């Protein structure tokens, strides 16, 4: 329903978020452990504070500075890629990290009762062995070819 909310409010539904939803929220990908350049005090590119992903750090200005006026609005600079808008958008835009290998969510594994164990009928000890690379697990076996 309402995205940013104008205060007419019917429900507040909660649920699990799939990878598709995570990539739908995101405005970009973070792929560099850089935060700020300490020689010009401006955020790095593709870092945790990238202006292209999260938005401009100043009202109506881009990274390359080709645009600095209010007349320019809703247009993405073709050189730096930063969208010209107000700085408050830095409080609203999210990023995402594309993991190279799958990872489990700790809330649903460590928390007692282990809700991954109940779903799969696995004791916590063996499950912890599997997900931290301390034992193998048979994910399938073919009975037709078996005998």
Partner 1 sequence: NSVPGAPNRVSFAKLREPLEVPGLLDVQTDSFEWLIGSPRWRESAAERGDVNPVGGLEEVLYELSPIEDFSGSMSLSFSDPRFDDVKAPVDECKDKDMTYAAPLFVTAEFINNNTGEIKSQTVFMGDFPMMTEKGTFIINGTERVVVSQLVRSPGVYFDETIDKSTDKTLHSVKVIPSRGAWLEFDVDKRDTVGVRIDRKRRQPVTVLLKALGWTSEQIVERFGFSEIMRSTLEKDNTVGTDEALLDIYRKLRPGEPPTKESAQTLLENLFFKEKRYDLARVGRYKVNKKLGLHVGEPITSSTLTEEDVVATIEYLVRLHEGQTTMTVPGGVEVPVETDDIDHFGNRRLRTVGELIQNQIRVGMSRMERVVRERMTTQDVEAITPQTLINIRPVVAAIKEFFGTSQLSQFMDQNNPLSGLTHKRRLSALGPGGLSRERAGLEVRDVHPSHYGRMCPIETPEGPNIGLIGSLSVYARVNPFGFIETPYRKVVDGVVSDEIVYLTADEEDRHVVAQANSPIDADGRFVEPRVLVRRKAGEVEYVPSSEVDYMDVSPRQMVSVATAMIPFLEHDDANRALMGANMQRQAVPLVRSEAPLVGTGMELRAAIDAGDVVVAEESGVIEEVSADYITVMHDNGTRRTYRMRKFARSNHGTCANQCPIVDAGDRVEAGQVIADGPCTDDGEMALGKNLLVAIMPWEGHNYEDAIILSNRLVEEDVLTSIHIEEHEIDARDTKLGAEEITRDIPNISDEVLADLDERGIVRIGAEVRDGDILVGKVTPKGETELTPEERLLRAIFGEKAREVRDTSLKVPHGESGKVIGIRVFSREDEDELPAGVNELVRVYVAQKRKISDGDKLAGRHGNKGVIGKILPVEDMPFLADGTPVDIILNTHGVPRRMNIGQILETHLGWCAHSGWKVDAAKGVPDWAARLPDELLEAQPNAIVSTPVFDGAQEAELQGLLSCTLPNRDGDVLVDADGKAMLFDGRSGEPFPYPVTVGYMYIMKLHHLVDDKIHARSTGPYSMITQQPLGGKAQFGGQRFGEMECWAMQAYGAAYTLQELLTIKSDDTVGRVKVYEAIVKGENIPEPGIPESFKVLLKELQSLCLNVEVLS
Partner 2 sequence: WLSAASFQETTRVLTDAAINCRSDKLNGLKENVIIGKLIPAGTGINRYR
Partner 3 sequence: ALKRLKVVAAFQQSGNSPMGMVLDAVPVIPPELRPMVQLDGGRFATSDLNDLYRRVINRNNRLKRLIDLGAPEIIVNNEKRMLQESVDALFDNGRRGRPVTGPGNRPLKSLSDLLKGKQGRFRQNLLGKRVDYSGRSVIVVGPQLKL
**Residue 77 labelled as part of a binding site:** yes
- Dist CA 54 CA 112 (whole Å): 37
The two tokens of residue 1 are: 């329903």
Site for DNA in 96-125 (CB under 7 A): 110, 112-114, 117, 123-125
Contact characters 2-41, DNA, x per CB under 7 A = -------------------------------x--------
Instruction: Answer for the pair 27, 40: CB distance below 8 angstroms, yes or no.
Output: no
Q: In the set 3, 4, 6, 14, which binds partner 2 (CB under 8 A)? A: 14
**Residue 50 labelled as part of a binding site:** no
Query: 135, 107, 110, 136: which is closest to 124 by C-alpha?
Result: 110
- Dist CA 94 CA 20 (whole Å): 14
The two tokens of residue 24 are: 């739908």
**Residue 80 labelled as part of a binding site:** yes
| Positions at the binding site for Zn(2+) | 62, 64, 77, 80
Binding site for DNA (CB under 7 A): 33, 110, 112-114, 117, 123-125
């Amino acid at each position: 329903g309402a995205m940013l909310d104008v205060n007419f409010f019917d429900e507040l539904r909660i649920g699990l978020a799939t990878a598709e939803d995570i990539r739908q929220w995101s405005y970009g990908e973070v792929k560099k452990p850089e935060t700020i350049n300490y020689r010009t005090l401006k955020p790095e590119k593709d870092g945790l504070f990238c202006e292209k992903i999260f938005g401009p750090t100043r009202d109506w200005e881009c990274y390359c500075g080709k645009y600095k006026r209010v007349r320019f609005k809703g247009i993405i600079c073709e050189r730096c890629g930063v969208e010209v808008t107000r700085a408050k958008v830095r409080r609203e835009r999210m990023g995402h990290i594309e993991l190279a290998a799958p990872v489990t969510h700790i809330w649903y594994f460590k928390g007692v009762p282990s809700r991954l164990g109940y779903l799969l009928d696995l004791a916590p000890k063996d499950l912890e062995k599997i997900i931290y690379f301390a034992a193998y697990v048979i994910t399938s076996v073919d009975e037709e070819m078996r005998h």
